[PDB]
């Protein structure tokens, strides 16, 4: 004779946007170091990188 129903409840209708992509951008700093050496051989004749 009868059956149940299906209720739909709506609370808020806000203006949002879609999700095209997602990523995380972390904060970075400045770190560096070096070393001073002498030629003392044929490894540093003219330049450091040959080609």
């Amino acid at each position: 004779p009868d059956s149940k129903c299906l209720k739909i409840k709506v609370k808020r209708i806000n203006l949002k946007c879609k999700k095209s992509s997602s990523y995380f951008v972390p904060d970075a700093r400045s770190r560096c170091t070096s070393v001073r050496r002498c030629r003392w051989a044929g490894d540093c004749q003219s330049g450091c990188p040959p080609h």
Partner: protein, 52 residues
Amino acid sequence: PHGIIWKVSPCAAWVPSAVIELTMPSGEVRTFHPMSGIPTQVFKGVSVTYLG
């Protein structure tokens, strides 16, 4: 022959900056030059930055 050396540094931002003489509560006193929104070589966790 002479050996004159020039130092060029191009820049097209011209953001405001200042100097900061920070003194830690332990007793150490150091100085550094912060920029407008740019990290300033954080020393022992402190990352005080300047905004323009």
